[PDB]
Design a protein around this ligand. Structure first.
Ligand SMILES: [Mg+2]
Ligand SMILES: [Mg+2]
Lengths: 106, 61, 167, 127, 122, 197
RNA sequence: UUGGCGGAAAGGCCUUGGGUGCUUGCUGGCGAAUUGCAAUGUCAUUUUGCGUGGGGAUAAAUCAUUUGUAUACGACUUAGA
RNA sequence: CCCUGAAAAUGGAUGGCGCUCAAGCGUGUUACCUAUACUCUACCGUCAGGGUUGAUAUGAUGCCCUGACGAGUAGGCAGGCGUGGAGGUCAGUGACGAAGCCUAGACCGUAAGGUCGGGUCGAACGGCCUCUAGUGCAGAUCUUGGUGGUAGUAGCAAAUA
RNA sequence: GAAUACUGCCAGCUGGGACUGAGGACUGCGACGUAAGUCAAGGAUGCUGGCAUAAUGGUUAUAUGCCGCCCGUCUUGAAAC
RNA sequence: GAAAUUGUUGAAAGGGAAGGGCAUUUGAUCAGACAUGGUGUUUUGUA
């Protein structure tokens, strides 16, 4: 067809933070479509990929991926907490990111 | 935080393993620490503690 | 001497591990996976394609087929955590899948010397595929539009919420 | 070829540098504790440099081990090298910096015969 | 070294405003340029492709005199002399080409994808 | 969900719209706000004129040129209210603010596009009926904006052209609705009705 | 390709005619495997350079000289085949 | 509750934007955010309580088991790192290159520090057990010596040329 | 004559998610079993894939998010005008 | 033949200082493990 998307779009909002101290080890993700923790409970444990590009070709590609997963819900509005192998570079606040449907329970 | 009722990390204040560098005294306290550990007699513990003592705590008899 | 010595050397004998208590009970699959279910492949080379599930294998994998005449997916095994069990059900009674096992799919592992600088199929595999898919498509022809459904790919459109979608 | 060990973890892999060693050239970056009465580093304010303490200490099963898994032992000649004959899987030899090349070839030959690992088998070598 | 010097129209060539005419420096530099051209023709160079490839100036030891200031004080009056060196070379052609081999590492999935593309197209 | 979101600023409250839009930019949504002369501020016109005069008094004493700049256009008033809610002095704030452009009227890049509203910042949904409000264009031309009438003339021309568009669109959709109704009650229509479409 | 309309930042919208390709509106035939149980598995647009081969056109500014409606110096205003 | 009473000097502060059935005031119910605090786990150290001379191989100040604890100026104590020189030892290193110096190169230690590779260089130096002291610097308007910014700056204009 | 709400109990069942895997022959307390034996009972094992190299990682420079006042001294109090 | 301080070359950043801490992107640079004993001799220098 014309669409081939097998993931859900999301936005990298910020780190986990207090009013004046942030914590880069936990990122905050807005998954689009979900507006409550009860709907966000479907997406727990799903893999997340941040997909970006670079000028230098490394192993056949100019596209590099950072992997992570959803761990828990955050707040009352469907924001989730996500942890990555290496933390997200904080210039990606507001950048798009992919939530895959695996590991599936359905 | 703990509301400590005592001084933390304090030494017991009783001298063990005597401050002398006498090798025969160290052999004697090795023998008597074996005896105090395993013979379950109070005499061995008493003489083991008396072996640690300094000169002014060991008056001549 | 430059360095003097260590007064004690550590022993070089390696100790044995303790006797473990982790036995292997078999995998308890989720309830939506019954044999004959149409699955959607979430990842892999054939991602977004709808296949039919036949047999639960020994290494917790699912035996699936396209059929190969419909969408070009061969006889294959997939992971149960990488599929979506749709509610669409066909009957796979009349297919002899006990031939396939974990030794049926062997990669014939490659040596470190054989490096592909620049750059085939088992005949046993191809007539096994031809035996099973002609038994599947006879069950496919009963209810309408299943051949078209299995040939078409799955993809998420704008406005599709997977937490609200029923498959 | 080393003895099996747990995963080596460094609690603080960054070097502890003296406060204002970046600021003044007369202040070397060897660690000194701030004994000042108003020092933010001594008072441990947020956003300042961290200080060395006993909590950063390495695991006793992991301490003094190279990433290869051996402990470095400095050697000066063949008789010093031969002390590691029965302890090859725990210690690795390192030729001292002041050994000449014509002795270094002898030490490397004897270590290769005895199966001993040398951590610097490239010093003063001509090609 | 240009703070508080005068401004001039002849810096428009170089996009600056502050420019001067250091006659003594020009005399010394052009004497060294003449000597280097003489060395080049003695060595047997082309004498038409020469460009000044290297030049640097750094400080010689100072030469000190005295200055007499009010209320009977002495200050310094020091000359700051120069060490100058320069190298003229012939302008050659393009330097080099044929860079590194850049050996590639591909996974089995990448190799299967490239083989699939090579099969699926011509 | 959208590449660019075009917001019709008419009938909106300035602070509530700015707090919606600033969060949208910080999340990464591109926003363009049109018709900035029709924003509303709650309160009397005299109260908001006094507020702007209190703001207009504030300037740097030794040099007025480096003081706070008092911008007079309604779009720049909205930009001031939004820059107050974005941390504009950082690189993240600058990158957020470059995803925004605010206009008086609807310029020709955006007069053929779709305009949306924000229902949690709409005056008729937020204020109690009876409370008094202002128009940002009236306040701005009271404090020194020069282009209130040329925007009105351009908006009149644009509305005439848009009504000419809408008449044709309405005629076409009535033809399409007539054909859909006559092509309904067939077998595919009843099967789609059973399946929910 | 024909005809319009659009100046707020128009640079876009509509329309006439023919060509050409596809059509999943409906019914068929062949292909796909081996990326080995997943690895973004690579499909977008931004700028520049160098080659082709096809058009298009053949300038000024500054320094120096000069002026004094200008001027600390720069700058400004003039003149000079 | 709101309003009058209610006047100060640079421009101005419920923190700012702003907010009017509030994003105000009174009150109630839930959900949610996060401290070096609490719970669980790992690791480091300290303290305490214990086990273990049996043969083989070492270290009994050793090895092992268990539990609790960890803020800190003035100050006290303990364990260590480094320097000049001395007794002993490694029949230590070295002109096939000692010492020194440079090195956004590598390794070890929580740290003081230690080790290696490369460059430069040219004649002595090191590990360990002990002994000894003119033994560790950022400051003292510290001492001696050297060098900057200021800065191509102030200026080099009395005595007719 | 019932139901339901509210509160409380179950040594009732069961689904999803995250972090941790310390220890290293055996010894103990138990459970299911007539027994052999088995087990979730004094701390993680089994199966599989890719790569085997700057890919992970270390160092260093830069960028981004948040934080960070100049040290020493006297002082009740120092970033101190 | 050190440092202060300086010249050239190279790399990098720079909207009213610079420097630092935690974390990661990007660029540059770099260490370690990769054999192992092994059924085995498909073997040459026959062990
Ligand atoms: Mg320094
Ligand atoms: Mg004078």
């Amino acid at each position: 067809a014309e669409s081939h998307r097998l993931y859900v779009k999301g936005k990298h909002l910020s780190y986990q933070r207090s009013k004046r101290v942030n914590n880069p080890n936990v990122s905050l993700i807005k998954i689009e479509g979900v507006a409550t923790p009860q709907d966000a409970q479907f997406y727990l444990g799903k893999r997340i990929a941040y997909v970006y590009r670079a000028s230098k070709e490394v192993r056949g590609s100019k596209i590099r991926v950072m992997w992570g997963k959803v761990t828990r819900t955050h707040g009352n509005s469907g924001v989730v907490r996500a942890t990555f192998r290496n933390n997200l570079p904080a210039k990606t606040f507001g950048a798009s990111v992919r939530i895959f449907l695996y590991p599936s329970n359905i | 935080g703990i509301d400590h009722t005592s001084k933390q990390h304090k030494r017991s204040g009783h001298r063990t393993a005597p401050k002398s560098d006498n090798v025969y005294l160290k052999l004697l306290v090795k023998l008597y620490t074996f005896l105090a550990r395993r013979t379950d007699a109070p005499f061995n513990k008493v003489v083991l503690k008396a072996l640690f003592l300094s000169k002014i705590n060991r008056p001549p008899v | 001497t430059a360095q003097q010595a260590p007064k004690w050397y550590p022993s070089e004998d390696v100790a044995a591990p303790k006797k473990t208590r982790k036995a292997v009970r078999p995998q308890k699959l989720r309830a939506s996976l019954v044999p004959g279910t149409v699955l959607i492949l979430l990842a892999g080379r054939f991602r977004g394609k709808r296949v039919v599930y036949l047999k639960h294998l020994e290494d917790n994998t699912l035996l699936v087929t396209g059929p190969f005449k419909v969408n070009g997916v061969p006889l294959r095994r997939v992971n149960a955590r990488y599929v979506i069990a749709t509610s669409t059900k066909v009957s796979v009674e009349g297919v002899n899948v006990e031939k396939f096992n974990v030794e049926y799919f062997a990669k014939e592992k490659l040596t470190k010397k054989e490096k592909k600088e620049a750059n085939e199929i088992k005949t046993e595999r191809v007539e096994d595929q031809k035996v099973v898919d002609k038994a599947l498509l006879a069950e496919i022809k009963k209810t309408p539009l299943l051949k078209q459904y299995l040939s078409a790919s799955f993809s998420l459109k704008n406005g599709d919420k997977p937490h609200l979608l029923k498959f | 070829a080393s003895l099996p060990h747990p995963k080596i973890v460094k609690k603080h892999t960054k070097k502890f540098k003296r406060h204002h060693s970046d600021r003044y050239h007369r202040v070397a970056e060897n660690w000194r504790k701030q004994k000042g009465i108003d020092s933010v580093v001594r008072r441990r304010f947020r956003g300042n440099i961290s200080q060395p303490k006993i909590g950063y200490g390495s695991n006793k099963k992991t301490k003094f081990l190279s990433p290869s898994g051996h402990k470095t032992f400095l050697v000066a000649n063949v008789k010093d090298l031969e002390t590691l004959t029965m302890h090859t899987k725990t210690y690795a030899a390192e030729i001292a910096h002041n050994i000449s090349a014509k002795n270094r070839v002898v030490i490397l030959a004897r270590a290769k015969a005895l199966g001993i690992k040398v951590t610097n088998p490239k010093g003063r070598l001509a090609l | 070294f240009n703070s508080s010097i005068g401004r001039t129209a002849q810096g428009k060539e170089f996009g600056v405003t502050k420019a001067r005419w250091p006659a003594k420096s020009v005399k010394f530099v052009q004497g060294l340029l003449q000597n280097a051209a003489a060395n080049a023709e003695a060595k047997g160079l082309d004498a038409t492709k020469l460009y000044v490839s290297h030049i640097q100036v750094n400080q010689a030891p100072k030469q000190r005199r005295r200055t007499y200031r009010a209320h009977g004080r002495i200050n310094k009056y020091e000359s700051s002399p120069s060490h100058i060196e320069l190298v003229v070379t012939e302008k050659e052609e393009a330097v080099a080409k044929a860079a590194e081999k850049k050996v590639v590492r591909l996974t089995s999935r990448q190799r299967g994808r490239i083989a699939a593309q090579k099969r699926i197209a011509a | 969900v959208e590449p660019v979101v075009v917001i019709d600023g008419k009938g909106h409250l300035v602070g509530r719209l700015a707090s919606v839009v600033a969060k949208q930019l910080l999340n990464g949504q591109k926003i363009v706000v049109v018709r900035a002369e029709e924003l509303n501020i709650s309160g009397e016109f005299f109260r908001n004129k006094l507020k702007y005069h209190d703001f207009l008094r504030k300037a740097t004493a030794f040099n007025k040129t480096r003081g706070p700049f008092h911008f007079r256009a309604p779009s720049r008033i909205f930009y001031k209210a939004l820059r107050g809610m974005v941390s504009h002095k950082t690189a993240r704030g600058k990158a957020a603010l470059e995803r925004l452009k605010v206009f008086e009227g609807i310029p020709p890049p955006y007069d053929k596009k779709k305009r949306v509203v924000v229902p949690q910042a709409l005056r008729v949904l937020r204020l109690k009926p009876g409370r008094k409000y202002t128009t940002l264009g009236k306040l701005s031309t009271s404090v020194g904006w020069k282009y209130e009438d040329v925007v009105a003339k351009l908006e009149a021309k644009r509305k005439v052209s848009s009504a000419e568009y809408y008449a044709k669109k309405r005629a076409f959709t009535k033809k399409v609705a007539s054909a859909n109704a006559t092509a309904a009650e067939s077998d595919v229509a009843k099967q789609l009705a059973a399946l929910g479409y």
